[PDB]
Amino acid sequence: RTQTGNNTTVNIIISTVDYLLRVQESISDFYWYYSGKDVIDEQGQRNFSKAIQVAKQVFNTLTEYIQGPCTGNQQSLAHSRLWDAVVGFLHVFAHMQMKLSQDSSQIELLKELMDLQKDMVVMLLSMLEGNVVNGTIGKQMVDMLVESSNNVEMILKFFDMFLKLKDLTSSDTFKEYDPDGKGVISKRDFHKAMESHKHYTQSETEFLLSCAETDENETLDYEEFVKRFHEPAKDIGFNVA
Sequence letter at residue 116: L
Dist. CA 40–CA 31, nearest whole Å: 10
Dihedral sign for Cα atoms in the order 108, 226, 219, 94? negative
Task: Please check whether residue 99 is in contact with residue 208, taking contact to mean a CB–CB distance below 8 angstroms.
Answer: no
Sign of CA dihedral 93, 155, 151, 203: positive
Q: Classify 9 as helix, strand or coil.
A: coil
Question: Which residue type does 55 have?
Answer: A
Cβ neighbour number for residue 98 with a 10 Å cutoff: 16
Euclidean distance between CA atoms 101 and 45, whole angstroms? 14
- Integer Cα distance of 60 and 89 in angstroms: 15
Method: cryo-EM
Question: Resolution in A, one decimal?
Answer: 3.2
Residue 139 and residue 144: Cα distance in Å, rounded?
A: 9
The single-letter code of the amino acid at 83 is: W
Q: Which amino acid is at 63?
A: T
187-209 b/e with 16+ CB inside 10 Å = b?
eeebeebbeebebbeeeebebbe
- Asked if residues 55 and 17 have their Cβ atoms less than 8 Å apart, the reply is no
> How far apart are alpha carbons 162 and 154 in whole angstroms?
13
Contacts of 158 (CB under 8 A, 6+ apart): 94, 97, 98, 233
User: Would you put residue 218 in left (φ > 0), alpha (ψ -120 to 50) or beta?
Assistant: left
What does the angle CA 189 – CA 158 – CA 127 come to, to the nearest 5 degrees? 150
CA distance 114 to 108: 10
> CA 125, CA 7: separation in Å to the nearest integer?
34
> Do 120 and 155 touch, CB atoms closer than 8 A?
no
Are residues 49 and 111 in contact, defined by beta-carbon separation less than 8 angstroms? no
Give ∠ CA 168-172-175 in degrees, rounded to 5.
90
Q: Identify which of 142, 122, 139, 140 has the alpha carbon closest to the alpha carbon of residue 67.
A: 122
Concatenating the DSSP letter of every residue in 154-223 gives HHHHHHHHHHHHHHHHHSHHHHHHS-STT-EEEHHHHHHHHHHS--S-HHHHHHHHHHSPP-TTSEEEHH
Please provide residue 202's backbone torsions phi and psi, each rounded to the nearest 5 degrees.
-65, -40
For residue 118, the one-letter residue type is: K
Q: Is 111 exposed, middle or buried (0-12, 13-18, 19+ CB in 10 A)?
A: middle
List of E strands, the chain: 184-186, 219-221
3-state helix, strand, coil in the chain (%, to 5): 75, 0, 25
